[PDB]
Design a binder for this molecule. Structure first.
Ligand code: RIT
Lengths: 99, 99
């Protein structure tokens, strides 16, 4: 679909068998989700944004379904104030910015 | 134009007579630019991001030209690690996410 921006671009994602809402975030290189249950191995990593950095857990090759599209990629888990779907995954579902 | 996301969505903006590059950021409610010279009055404000928060200066109704489109709106200036064009201005140039 086409999503205009007067409102936060929140979409429904299914990951690890759970349903969550997250922001389609063109300004994020990576995808970061609030503390959640994920299967597999994971290396600790650190990500930063406005305000500073957060310690997070990097899980590689996770399957995720965004607003209906599937993609596989890296998902970071941590105390993020908001679930963010970053470019690593937006490219996969073929998301583009248009004006 | 249409902008895909394999690379950071950096565009050229002209604001306060100066040229800068900034990120089209659907994940940002507001537009925050690095320490720069702006004319007019401004109230102090505080914004937060992934790693916490930053203190910035809020300037209202600033004219800005993004990748060729003009818009008027609020611009915050501060020690942001990156110039971000948020939804307040992206709506103005008619930007939409499409997949
Ligand atoms: C509380 C919560 C439910 C929400 N609040 C808001 C409102 N807020 C605060 C914002 O929009 N705030 C913006 C912001 O930081 N947005 C963020 C999402 C977010 C929202 C709330 C809390 C934490 C993170 C999302 C933005 O795309 C920023 C922009 C950016 C890029 C480089 C350097 C600095 C900044 N990106 C990131 O923080 O990316 C982190 C990464 C992802 N992959 C790798 S690092 C500011 C720039 C204005 C939306 S959702």
């Amino acid at each position: 679909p086409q999503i205009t921006l007067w409102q936060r671009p929140l979409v429904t994602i299914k990951i690890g068998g759970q349903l969550k809402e997250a922001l389609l975030d063109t300004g994020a290189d990576d995808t970061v989700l609030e503390e959640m249950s994920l299967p597999g191995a994971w290396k600790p990593k650190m990500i930063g944004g406005i305000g500073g950095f957060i310690k997070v857990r990097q899980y590689d090759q996770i399957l995720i379904e965004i607003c209906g599209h599937k993609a596989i990629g890296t998902v970071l888990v941590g105390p993020t104030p908001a679930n963010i779907i970053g470019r690593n995954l937006l490219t996969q579902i073929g998301c583009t910015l248009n004006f």
